[PDB]
Amino acid sequence: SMAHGPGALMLKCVVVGDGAVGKTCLLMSYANDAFPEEYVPTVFDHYAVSVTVGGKQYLLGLYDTAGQEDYDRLRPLSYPMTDVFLICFSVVNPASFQNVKEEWVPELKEYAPNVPFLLIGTQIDLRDDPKTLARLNDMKEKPICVEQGQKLAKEIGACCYVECSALTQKGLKTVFDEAIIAILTP
């Protein structure tokens, strides 16, 4: 190794889900072990981190994707040779939860048929924020709870349900550990 540093098998994880569920922030927060305080992009640059699985090392490549409608056309460009997807919804946006079964799961079933994926509930620090709960209880909506995520993950055939907050980093480690296990599960 005079020409280059440590190297390793590269794996590819792509993140999909609704506008404003926290995909980008989930990725920047995992990568930098801090919530992005400065300027947050629509889409985070391709980025990888080293992990140590079962005494073997791997580079987990992290691909972000926009969930709006300007970025519809070009999104499936990210999908080829993916090893695992994360389908994110925000536990304080029920509408994104209903878009799992009805928008993100069909898209994956059409383009990466036999690629495993997880179901990730995001922004769980808002689940009991006074300001948020009340904005929600204006529409007699309430936050998605843990039991609803687990149930939904089974129906759709996700490998599991994991929750996190990008803000405090709770659950983040588990999200990506489980993405790896789901891949390295021969």
Ligand X SMILES: Nc1nc2c(ncn2[C@@H]2O[C@H](COP(=O)(O)OP(=O)(O)NP(=O)(O)O)[C@@H](O)[C@H]2O)c(=O)[nH]1
Please state the residue numbers annotated as binding site for GTP: 17-24, 64-68, 122-125
Cα Rg of the chain, angstroms: 17
Judge whether 50 and 57 are in contact, CB under 8 Å: yes
- By CB under 5 A, is residue 12 in contact with Mg ion? no
Phi, psi at 11, each rounded to 5°: -110, 160
Minimum distance from residue 58 beta carbon to ligand X (Å): 25
- Out of Mg ion, ligand X, none, what residue 99 binds, judged by CB under 5 to 8 A for its kind, is none
Query: Which of 23, 79, 96, 120 touches Mg ion by CB under 5 A?
Result: 23
Minimum distance from residue 168 beta carbon to ligand X (Å): 8
Judge whether 133 and 124 are in contact, CB under 8 Å: no
β-pair type (117-122, 47-52): unpaired
Contacts with ligand X by CB under 6 A lie at 19-25, 40, 42, 66-68, 122-123, 125-126, 165-167
Query: Which of 11, 16, 24, 115 touches Mg ion by CB under 5 A?
Result: 24
Phi, psi at 108, each rounded to 5°: -75, -35
Which residue type does 146 have? V
Instruction: Decide whether 22 or 143 has the Cβ nearer to ligand X.
Output: 22
Q: Tokens 């999908």, residue?
A: 79
Minimum distance from residue 109 beta carbon to ligand X (Å): 21
